[PDB]
Every structure is written in structure tokens, then in C-alpha cells.
Amino acid sequence: LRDVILVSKDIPEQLCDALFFYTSHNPKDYADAFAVRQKFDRNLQTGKQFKFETVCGLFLLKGVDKITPGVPAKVLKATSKLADLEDIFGVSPFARKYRELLKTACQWSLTVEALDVRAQTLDEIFDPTEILWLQVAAKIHVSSMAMRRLVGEVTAKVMDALGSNLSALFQIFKQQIVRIFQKALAIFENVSELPQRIAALKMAFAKCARSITVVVMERTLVVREFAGTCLASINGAVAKFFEELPNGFMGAKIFTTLAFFKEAAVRIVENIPNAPRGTKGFEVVGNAKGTQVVVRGMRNDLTLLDQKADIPVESEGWSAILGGHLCYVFRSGDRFYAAPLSGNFALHDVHCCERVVCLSDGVTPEINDGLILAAIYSSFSVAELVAAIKKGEPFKFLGHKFVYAKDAAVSFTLAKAATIADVLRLFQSARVKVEDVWSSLTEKSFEFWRLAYGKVRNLEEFVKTCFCKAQMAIVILATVLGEGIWHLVSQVIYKVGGLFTKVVDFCEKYWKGFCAQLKRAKLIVTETLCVLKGVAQHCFQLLLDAIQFMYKSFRKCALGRIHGDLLFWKGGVHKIIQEGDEIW
Amino acid sequence: LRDVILVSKDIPEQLCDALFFYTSHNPKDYADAFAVRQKFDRNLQTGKQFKFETVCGLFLLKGVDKITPGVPAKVLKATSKLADLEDIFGVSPFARKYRELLKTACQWSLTVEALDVRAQTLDEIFDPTEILWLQVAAKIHVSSMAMRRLVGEVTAKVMDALGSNLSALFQIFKQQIVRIFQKALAIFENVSELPQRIAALKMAFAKCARSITVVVMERTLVVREFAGTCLASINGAVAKFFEELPNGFMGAKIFTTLAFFKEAAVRIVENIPNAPRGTKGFEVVGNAKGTQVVVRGMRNDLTLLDQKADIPVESEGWSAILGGHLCYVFRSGDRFYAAPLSGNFALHDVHCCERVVCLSDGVTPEINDGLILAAIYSSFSVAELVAAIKKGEPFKFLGHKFVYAKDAAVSFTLAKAATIADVLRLFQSARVKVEDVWSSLTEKSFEFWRLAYGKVRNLEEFVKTCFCKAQMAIVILATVLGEGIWHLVSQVIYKVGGLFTKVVDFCEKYWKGFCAQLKRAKLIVTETLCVLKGVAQHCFQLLLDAIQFMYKSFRKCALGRIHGDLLFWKGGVHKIIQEGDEIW
């Protein structure tokens, strides 16, 4: 039924507006008004005819660039006027108020004052829906004049989104906003680019049409809705003001009573409860990224370093007073780290921490061997650690700083009553075990030291406690017998009563050159004689005894007894192979 | 052509364990260990072939009910033991430790004490990997034993997840954890249901493998990971402790210093700073649901109401002291709401607010009409609105209470000096406009009052102001003349100097009866007299003149003169339509 009205691609901006202003669409905001109008714009320019719903009823429109004589229907083309269109459709109370505004376009477009006067009084003769339609119009003359109403509207939204905290920043924001909207809307300068700036400004207005949000990114306030648009230079200018601000605690920017971390603004609160008089805390304002955390208690064993660290903030941790500030501190990968705290909210500016331990009685034999144990577990160089212990200066090791002087206001001390286990407790972790591995001889005790010895192939030279010397002595004698001989002695050494006590007591006074001697030991075991041939001083009689009593079995015997392939004779235990020319 | 070992679908648990215990997979936690074992388990009941990586390197296993007699394959029948299992794969340093533990099942499984005693010392003999495999083992006797060390582990995690702040709640928690784990792991009571209790418990300890997380749901502490498992009764027990705590500000649950809202716990901080002495505020702790908000400033014009509302917290708003607490208030759908505030964080326990206005000189004529206008704008029934004013008692309109007395609690009064526009300022919203529509005659004035009159058909009766009275008399005349003949008079009324002031002044002294008489008016126009018959006195001569001046065009005074489609004869103005048995 309904008949298509033809319209020429190439109708002028004012005609297109006039045409469009017949629409009965009601816009909620700039963005949908903008969106609808460019849908309509696109429909005319693409071929097949669509529906227009107008205040005079539905119609149909066909974009027609190929205008040949052809048939005679309802047509439109650049030289048409409001009267032409009235013939097709009828009255539009809008379109008529429109090109009266068009007619008066030589009174109000005359100067900046005239233009603002028209903008501000546009509601006297227009209503909210039409003002948005004008603000989105194709005639630049008209669309750059009403868009002027929007500058203050956006300023108001930005002030609102900022908060009364932040109000001393209102003027810095309003100047930049005015400066950038002036350049964008300039009628009397940069005139060749006016159509570009107005097109760009429509998109910006679309992005800022329903809510404004202010956030902190890289220690500056950012208006999110401006980013990625021609308004972005507003952010840029504000960033320049923030970049010039002084630095402060944990790398924030400081402005009056506020501080700006990477992703959050905080208020600096003075004289906070439950702390030393003088202590400051933080109170996050506005929109702020970070982590809600659980606090397990206060600790004062940590010292805050200047280094920043890119570590995710753990959701569990402790509070601490660091540099006069209530802070969050936590543990991650065997290190201690600190972060700014606001109640239960941790910010992601993370700094390094260390734990300072005073060695009041120097590096004690117990301390020496537990540090070495901590190094072995953690794959830290034992030689490196030992070098640092010899200088007797301060040193850093696995998250701790060791110092000898009484204090630099720091308080965790080791002393002469330090257990090996006391020192291990400092570093106790997934890898660093506190379990006593030294004070008794057992097979897991043997197992630890045998593997350690694999890793640190001269660990005999660096173990200073008697217990650990005793264990390494046993390991060395297990590695000089070889496999097989050991396999057998294994089945007994852990059940020789008071053997370890034997080995400990001799390591206290005859340790020097001891291990060097063991390296030349060859076992030899006969009915009467059980000897470690080549070692004239040593502590394993008890073990040599139990060895030959266990040698009182399997008497198959040509030149002596025989476990399956080790025919122990008065030459020592031997199974051919080896050497180089058939030796005895 | 390689080991494709067979296994019988029924193989009792001890060997099923023993076989699987050849596994080479290192689990990172209980959830992994439980996963891998159950993967394996379901893989045999299939009857499909699959790879089983072990300490003895790669193998492949399948099985299916009653195995037939004779095949060249190694086969583990329903009654096969570890010996025949070492024919096949060989040596597992752990599977033997297992049968070692199984032998001793008579000594360590005798009492509660001996059971606990074997469970704390399983790491003497098994390693962390084997301990978890044991904790996931199929033989109940063993997994049930080994799971006992997990209770204390789960418990420490809960005390961590809780935090020092609620440490006075540790014992409640610990006690329900003990009570619920004892019943789950019980060996000597409820024996028939031990296989199920144990299976259910595995799922539980898989859900708490990893992290524990506390939260607040419905004003009580919840362990997330317990919910949906056999441990859930711990949550239920704790909820029961919470439902019996006193209620307190904005519907919270009070406990010592803290208040538990629906989804957040907070510390109650006393004597906050920017405040009247005695003012309290909140500080959220732990995991807390809510909304970061922007505060535009402090307001003291709101009263807090005692009634909870389920509406989204607006992200922009104000701060306010209600009930001696620092709170958040915000405007939504033309009403005011409050919410608990913690710094910048608003909780979702929204309460209703109102604004209390003292009508210090009663309902004045401007106040009467300003209220009526807001009503129309809001689609609030005028008749209902007008019944309340007549009662002269307090009443609730559009988020506002109106009272008449004077030092009642809060303070935003009206008085005889108040304009219509002062009253609209109170209700000012998207619908409620502060435009001056009454004080003079324009088309926009007329349009409003004509539409208003459409909706309120007797709005002539309720207006109290000379201005609004004058505005409605013109509406009445307009509607009694009709839409043509008014279509003509519309062209000059707005251009008759001084008319509205004459309508206002007349409505000031002769308003009684005037609209009723105006409603029976009939217009008459000839060169001699322009009149409205049946309205003796009236304020419209200066428009009767203007009508007669306009009566000067278009003449074929056939009966009498004509304009598009109408008459004006010596008897009235007419197009001849709706009436009975024709018309004179």
C-alpha cells in the first residue's frame, strides 16, 4: 500500500535536518539522539527504502542518487525547502521553529557573545528533545551553537564525580575543561578544520552522555569518559599537574592532605587510634583499585626498604608500623613485602621488606651451621654464605639482614644460646625444614647429609658444630667404602649403641685432618682383626666390631667369608674390575 | 606386544590401594591427590585400556568381571597379594611401607588415643606425598586414620582466615569444628555409616584443599569452602550463634565492638573526627560486599526512618549524621535513602529517609499551588493531595513530611514569604519542573494548564493563587469555546497587551462562581456587539474587542461572516454536527 517518497543523496545539510526533524523519536540522552540520527543518515545513503516514523504518521524513504527522468513520483532534491516537504508530509512544529532559527542565523552567529546568548536561551523557544536534536544536527552553523550548552553540563558532571574531597582541584579541572572545549568549539579560528572538530566532539559528547567516572591511573586523576576521545587532552593536562607534585610515602604524589598511589587516592589521616602518638594512616576516597585483606595481627619485626616490587598482594597478612605509617605486610615466595593499607583495603604499590637480626655473640658454631642448613635447603651458594660470614660485616641472606652492633632501632637477636633450630626458624618455609637432622644418627639424617654432600662437594670444610661434623664424617666414610660395602654396614650402624656419641666426642677435639685421613681408608675384616687400614686415629671401633660380628655368617670361604659378591679376605673387601694392570 | 596387565574389576580395597600406590604422580594438595585417585578408580570400572605411569615407569591396565581361564598376560585376580604385584611391576618403596602399616593395624587402631597417636607420627614413616595418598586411600581403616591430622590443619586455616579482629569468636568456631569433625571421623560409634561419612569427608577436604575464605552472608560469618559439604553444619552452628545476638543500628547484629550487616562486618569506631562529640562511624574488616561511592558533601536535612528498602545504592551521593552515626545518603527515584558508610564504601543495607518541612504559617496559597503542581508533575492524585491539606494534620508527600509545629526535630521551613517556585524546588526532579508557568500568559503556560486540566477535570476548584486562578479561567474559556474558534483566538491572546493582569485582578475579587458561569458561555460576533451570552461580569472584553478586529476579514456574510469552516451568524458560531433532531 504505502508509497515510497524519494530523496536525493546530496540534499544540503539544512534540508537533511529539516527532513529529519519530522521524526517522532524521543531521545533519552545525547548518545541515543546521536545514534538514531546517524542511523537515519546511513539509511538514505544505502539503497533500499526504510521506515521513518514522524509526528504526522509513518512514511517510507528511498535514497536516490541515480535520478533519471523515468517515472513521476514524490521526489526531493537539494533545491527543496520546508514548503516542499510540507507537501509530502505536513506540518512539523519542530522543522518550522528550525528554519526560523536558520533565518535568524545572521543575528546570533555574529559574535561569541551572540552565540552564547542563543545557546543559553535555546530553551525559551525549544524543548529538551529538540535541543538534543539540534546538538546532533548536520548543519554545523546550528550544531556548533547549541553544543555550547553542553560545556557547563559536562563540567557539572565532572565536579560531581570528583567529590567534596578533591574540591581544591575543582579550578584546575575547570580551567582545562574550558580551555579544551573552547578550542574544540572555536568558530572564529582554525576555521578550515571546524567540520572535523565538531564531528570529533559529537563522539566525545556521546561517550559522556549519562555517567562520568573519575579514577586514578598512574598517580593521576583520570576522567574515564574522556579517554580515547578529543577530550582526552583534558586528562593530559591534569596528568601534567600531577606529574609535577612532590613525591612522598611509598612513592605517592602528595597534594595537601591527600596522596595519590598508582591506582588509588587516599586521604592521609593523622593521629590514628591504637598506635604510637604520631602515626599516620590512610583512608581511600572515591574510586580505588586494590585488595581486601585479612589481618592476622600487628608485627614489628620488619624493616621497610625503598625498593618497589611487582608481586601480587596476598589476601592474608599482618599490619605494621613502617616509617610512621600503618601499613600492610605480607609473605610471598619466602620474602616479606609491605603495601599501603586503608582499613581492610591494600593498595598495589608494593615495597620490599627485610628482617634485621643482631648476632650479639658473633657467628656462633650453631648459627654458622643453621645458616648453612638454610642455604642448602634454599639452593643458596654455601661458599658465598661462608665468605660473608668471614668478613664479619653486615650481610643479606634469604630475606634477612645480619648485623653485629646492638641496634639501629631493630630488635630480633640470635645470641650464644642459639639452637641450629632457632636459626632455621628464621627461614622456615616449604623448602627450609626445621626438623633436627643433626643431633642423632638415623637413616634420614644420613640421607640429608649424603645428598647435601652431593650438592656441596666440600661441605666437610664448612660445618662447624660437632653434631654436623659427626654426620659429615659418617657420610665421608660411607663414600670411601663404596656401594655394596656400605649396603651391608647400613643394615647395622643405626643399631650400634652409643656410636654417634662416640663420633661426636672425637670430632670436638681431633677433627683437623680427620676427613682427609678417611679418604685413604680401606676396610679389611678377618676372624680376629677388624681394621680401617690407613687411618691410625679414628672413632669407629664400635662400628668395626658390629661389622665383623655381622661378618660371622656365610662362611663359604677360600681366603675368608663371602657376602654374595664381595669376598672379604685378608686383603680387604674386593670384587676384581678397576685399577690398571691386574693388581693384587 | 608389551605388558598390558589385567586387573579384576572387584579387587578389594587394600590391594586396589597397593596397586595404585605404585603411582609416580606428585600431588600439590589434597584436591589433586583426591582427583588423580578417583580418575584412576573410575578408569578400571570402565573396561577400557589406559596408561598408568609409575615408579617402575610406564604400564597399561584394564579389567572386566570374571576373567576367562588362560591368556599370555600377567593377571591380578580378586585375591592376589603384594607378592604377585611385585612379579608384575616390581618395587615400590611405599607400597611396602603400606603393608607394614597394615600389619600393625591391631595396635594403633585399638583406641581413640592409639589412633590419634599413630596419626601425629605418620610423618616419621611416610612423606608428605605418601601421607596425602594415605589420606585419600580406599581402605577406610587407613584414610580415616590419616585424615585426623587434617582437622588441626583445617582449623589453623580458619583462625587465619578469620583474623585477629574476631579472635573473641575463635573458640565458638574451634568448638564446632571439633564437634563436627569428631562425628565425621568417628570409628567407634555410628559404624554402619562410616564408609559414607568418610567418602563425604573426602569431598569436603578437597574443597578446603587450597585456601579458606571467610565471608558474611545474611548477618553471619560463613566459611565459603565448608558450604555445600558435610562440613556445612559448622556454618549452621555459627549462624545459630549469630541469630541470637542483639539487633542494632540499621539492622546490624551487635557483638562487642563490631556490627554485622547483611554482607559485611565493620568495627564500630567511636568519637570520629569531623563530627559532633559522640558520633560513631564504621570501618569494614575482612571480606565485605558493598559499593564504592563519591561523596558530594555533608547534608543535615534528612531524617532516618526505621524502614528497610531494596534498591541499588547510587554510586554518587552525600554524607550525613543519622542516629549519631556517619552515614551515606543518596537520591533514587525522587526519594532519599541511607546506607551504612565505611570511608568510601557503602553497604547494601539501605534504609528509607524523609525530608521534614515545617509549614510555619500553615498551607498558604502559593504553597497550596506549588504542592498541586508537583502532584500533577508526579502523577500524584490531586484530590488525595487536597484532602490532606484540608485536614491540617502532618502528612507524607513525595519524600517529604509536612508539619506545622515548630522545633519538632529537623529544619527546612516554608512561611508566608514562600513562592510557588520555592515549593517546587523541594520536589525538583526530571518530572517536577521549576519553570515559571503561572505568572504570565504564554502558549507554554496555556499548554501546561490545558493538559493538567485534561488529567484533573476539576482543577478549577483547587487552585488558590490569583495567577493559577487566572491561568485556569483562560483554560475554561478556551475549552468552552472549542478547538476551532479557539484555533482562531489563539493567534491574538498572547498579543493583547495587559490582558493577563486584568484576568489576574478580576480573579482576585470575583472568583467565586466565575468558572461555573464561564462554562455556560456562548460566543457571538457581529459588527455591533462582541459578547459571551450568560456571563454577566467577566474579565475578557479586551479579547472580545481583539476578536471583532479579527472579525474584519473574509466576507460573504451569507447568513453572516465566514472563516475556513465555520459561521458566525446572529446566533453563535457553528459547523453543524452533534445535536438532536438537527439545530435551529
Least CB–CB distance from A164: residue in B269, B288, B296: B296
As beta bridge partners, residue A60 has A51
What is the nearest CA distance from A443 to chain B, expressed in angstroms? 11
- Tell me the three cell numbers of residue B427: 520536589
Least CB–CB distance from A296: residue in B164, B211, B342: B164
Q: What angle do CA A176, A181, A183 make, to 5 degrees?
A: 100
- In three-state secondary structure terms, A310 is coil
Count CA atoms closer than 13 A to A272's CA, side-chain side: 17
Method used to determine the 3D structure = X-ray
Residue B527 CB partners (closer than 8 Å, separation 6+): B548, B551
Chain breaks in chain A (C to N over 2.5 A) after: none
**Alpha carbon A364 to its chain's center:** 40
Phi and psi dihedrals of B222, rounded to 5?
Answer: -130, 135
Count CA atoms closer than 13 A to A19's CA, side-chain side: 31
Contact with chain B for residue A233, Cβ under 8 A: no
- Tell me the three cell numbers of residue A45: 545513503
Q: How far is CA B196 from CA A107, B140, B186, B191, in A?
A: 90, 10, 12, 10
Q: Do B165 and A273 touch (CB under 8 A)?
A: no
Contact with chain B for residue A297, Cβ under 8 A: yes
- In three-state secondary structure terms, B220 is strand
Contact with chain B for residue A484, Cβ under 8 A: no
The rounded distance, in Å, linking the Cα atoms of B177 and B231 is 8
Q: What angle do CA A12, A16, A20 make, to 5 degrees?
A: 175
Residue A468 CB partners (closer than 8 Å, separation 6+): A369, A420, A438, A449
Please report, as a single letter, which amino acid is at residue A403: V
Best of A126, A344, A443 to disrupt the B interface by mutation (most B CBs within 10 Å)?
A344
Contact with chain A for residue B285, Cβ under 8 A: yes
The candidate with the shortest Cα–Cα distance to B197, out of B254, B127, B140, B259, is B140
Contact with chain A for residue B291, Cβ under 8 A: no
The rounded distance, in Å, linking the Cα atoms of B108 and B145 is 9
What is the nearest CA distance from B292 to chain A, expressed in angstroms? 6
How many of the other CB atoms lie within 10 Å of CB of A306? 8
Q: Do A163 and B295 touch (CB under 8 A)?
A: yes
Helices (H), A126-225: 128-134, 140-146, 149-162, 170-185, 194-207
Contact with chain A for residue B287, Cβ under 8 A: yes
Residue where the block lists cell 587516599: A266
The candidate with the shortest Cα–Cα distance to A540, out of A504, A583, A508, is A504
The candidate with the shortest Cα–Cα distance to A215, out of A291, A289, A292, A312, is A289
The rounded distance, in Å, linking the Cα atoms of A14 and B151 is 80
- Find the residue in B nearest to A283 (Cα): B343
Please report, as a single letter, which amino acid is at residue B462: F
* DSSP codes joined into one string, B366-388: HHHHHHHHHHHHHT--HHHHHHH
Q: How far is CA A423 from CA A420, A439, A459, B48, in A?
A: 5, 15, 19, 54
| Residue B199 DSSP symbol | H
Residue A291 CB partners (closer than 8 Å, separation 6+): A313, A315, A345, A346, A348
Q: Do A344 and B285 touch (CB under 8 A)?
A: yes
Least CB–CB distance from A286: residue in B163, B211, B344: B344
As beta bridge partners, residue B223 has B214
- In three-state secondary structure terms, A367 is helix
The candidate with the shortest Cα–Cα distance to B507, out of B454, B471, B458, B545, is B471
Q: Do A343 and B285 touch (CB under 8 A)?
A: yes
Q: Do B161 and A294 touch (CB under 8 A)?
A: yes
In chain B, what is the greatest distance between 2 CA atoms, to the nearest angstrom? 134
Residue where the block lists cell 637477636: A413
The rounded distance, in Å, linking the Cα atoms of A346 and A327 is 9
Least CB–CB distance from A284: residue in B161, B286, B343: B343
The rounded distance, in Å, linking the Cα atoms of B525 and B489 is 13
- Exposure string of A496-517, with b = 16+ CB inside 10 Å and e = fewer, is beebbebbbebbeeebeebbeb
Q: What angle do CA A521, A525, A530 make, to 5 degrees?
A: 75
Q: How far is CA B529 from CA A453, B521, B544, in A?
A: 129, 15, 9
Q: Per DSSP, which regions of B375-465 are E strands?
A: 395-397, 400-403
Q: How far is CA A247 from CA A244, A288, A342, A356, A381, in A?
A: 9, 19, 19, 27, 39
Residue B550 near residue B491 (C-beta atoms within 8 A): yes
Contact with chain A for residue B343, Cβ under 8 A: yes
The H or E element spanning position B103 is helix B95-103
The candidate with the shortest Cα–Cα distance to B59, out of B16, B10, B7, B2, is B2
Torsion of CA B200, B204, B209, B214, to 10 degrees: 180
| Residue B495 DSSP symbol | G
Q: How far is CA B299 from CA A148, A553, B330, in A?
A: 32, 99, 10
Give helix B443-455 / helix B466-481 axis angle, nearest 10°: 80
Least CB–CB distance from B160: residue in A161, A284, A316: A316
CA torsion sign for A17, A19, A21, A24 is negative
Contact with chain B for residue A316, Cβ under 8 A: yes
- Exposure string of B35-67, with b = 16+ CB inside 10 Å and e = fewer, is bbbeebeebbeeeeeeebebeeeebebbbeeeb
The rounded distance, in Å, linking the Cα atoms of B338 and B329 is 4
The rounded distance, in Å, linking the Cα atoms of B483 and B472 is 16
Phi and psi dihedrals of A375, rounded to 5?
Answer: -60, -45
The rounded distance, in Å, linking the Cα atoms of B568 and B555 is 11
Contacts of A286 in chain B (CB under 8 A): 292, 294, 344
Q: What angle do CA B533, B535, B538 make, to 5 degrees?
A: 125
Q: Do B295 and A164 touch (CB under 8 A)?
A: yes
Phi and psi dihedrals of B414, rounded to 5?
Answer: -110, 175
